[PDB]
């Protein structure tokens, strides 16, 4: 009867984007089209990411400029993580599960494949649950802020601190063993921190492909976000929030 009264996590559970497909089984397996498809697929997921974002309780109350900044700051974190989680669940941290119709064995993407597979195995190692994953993924949306601060900053930190407690409750709803909980919080939030370092190695490759491009097809949504962030990343206007400072 009071299972009717929804928690914040059951809410996060029902707004998770639906699976998307590369549209991919012409047939030859070339660099250009695989990269191009991944570009096109990353567009749709960023697009997904936004609808998702705009459903996260608290994300609404923040300023529109505050909403844009966070998505342009976190978009690569959300994909890196999501990919990890899927590769974790579909193939025990061993394969790179972009979509059902696109399962990439190692093979270019060395730095990428390595770093991406790390995330996945860490999820596999910790054996993260779905509620855990949901809270953790929302936290990644709130992973970085402008150094000059968000307009709705005071509000931002209120909401972010709320979603930590939720990842807390996810651990508690999982078991509540002992100091086992403490240790789990430690290891989970540590993983979130490593995300900062992983996304950087992924964000550069992405720029290098975007700029050094030679020819390669890119969607509107990514192009903008990319072109718009390069000067933000380049000038140091970003402040990476970490759990273990």
């Amino acid at each position: 009867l009071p299972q009717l009264t929804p928690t914040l996590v059951s809410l996060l559970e029902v707004i998770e984007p639906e699976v998307l497909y590369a549209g991919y089984d012409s047939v030859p397996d070339s660099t250009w089209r695989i990269m191009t498809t991944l570009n096109m697929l990353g567009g749709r997921q960023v697009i997904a990411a936004v609808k998702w974002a705009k459903a996260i309780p608290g994300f609404r109350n923040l300023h529109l400029d505050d909403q844009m900044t966070l998505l342009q700051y976190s978009w690569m974190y959300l994909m890196a993580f999501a990919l990890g989680w899927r590769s974790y669940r579909q193939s025990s941290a061993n394969l790179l599960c972009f979509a059902p119709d696109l399962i990439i064995n190692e093979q270019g993407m060395y730095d990428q494949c390595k770093h991406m597979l790390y995330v996945s195995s860490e999820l596999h190692r910790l054996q993260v649950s779905y509620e855990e994953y949901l809270c953790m993924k929302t936290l990644l949306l709130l992973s970085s802020v402008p150094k000059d601060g968000l307009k709705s900053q005071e509000l931002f930190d209120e909401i972010r601190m709320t979603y930590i407690k939720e990842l807390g409750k996810a651990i508690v709803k999982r078991e509540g063993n002992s100091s086992q909980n403490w240790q789990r919080f430690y290891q989970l939030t540590k993983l979130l921190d490593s995300m900062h370092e992983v996304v950087e190695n992924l964000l550069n490759y992405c720029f290098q492909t975007f700029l050094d491009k030679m020819s390669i097809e890119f969607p509107e949504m990514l192009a903008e976000i990319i072109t718009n962030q390069i000067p933000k990343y380049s000038n140091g206007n970003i402040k990476k929030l970490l759990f273990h400072q």
Binding site: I47, V50, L64
Partner: peptide, 9 residues
Amino acid sequence: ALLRYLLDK
């Protein structure tokens, strides 16, 4: 702008 419109839907 592209992102902007999408957030303002």
